[PDB]
Symmetry: C2
Subunit: 125 residues, 2 copies
């Protein structure tokens, strides 16, 4: 069936799969056709194919991804605020996006939009 409980489950694992570098795991909450539009607007990674590797291209640095708030889940949809912190060449950065998770009627996730902009990134000089 599904359930907010399950969508607040799938969200916790998605962050954990990420927060570990775990790449197979990030691919398993999704369906085989689900879409990815990150950042929101750009051309969308479709099929498991461009997804894994999209998650690949970003996981190249130890990303610390914690949930900065309570997940909100209702009617196949799941929203959640969070952080993405990463270092490279002595500087500290922090992306603050909001994902919008559309789950299909099977239990898996079927579209991931993630909202952030130049404002929602906090890097030092």
């Amino acid at each position: 069936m599904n359930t907010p409980e399950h969508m607040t489950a799938v969200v916790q694992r998605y962050v954990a799969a990420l927060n570990a570098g775990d790449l197979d795991g990030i691919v398993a909450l999704f369906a085989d056709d689900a879409t990815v539009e990150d950042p929101v607007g750009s051309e969308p990674r479709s099929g498991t194919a461009a997804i894994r590797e999209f998650y690949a291209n970003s996981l190249k640095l130890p990303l610390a991804v914690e949930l900065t708030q309570e997940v909100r889940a209702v009617a196949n949809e799941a929203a959640f605020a969070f952080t993405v912190s990463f270092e490279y060449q002595g500087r500290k950065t922090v992306v603050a996006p909001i994902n919008h998770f559309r789950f299909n009627g099977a239990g898996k996730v079927v579209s991931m939009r993630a909202l952030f902009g130049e404002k929602n990134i906090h890097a030092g000089a």
Copy 2:
């Protein structure tokens, strides 16, 4: 015309028109042809007429709405994380939704969705 910088203002002015019960303000921020979905799951209201009367009923009990984090906007699209606090029969109650708006080239909120479930309503007894 648009820009992420404009959306944070429309967010901020929604939050304001909520606290102070500024109805015109609220309805102003929207499209003359926009819809409301509070919560996601419910049937859509539409036409300024259908929106005002809705927002009319949300402001019977005073609303201490508060934004809990930086609002995130990219691609004519804006999401935020907030709480709508309010009291009835001495009970402190709070809502903790994540909303999503979507603008147009005109900068008028042409779609409001409110996302929160039972786990995201914080009142004791």
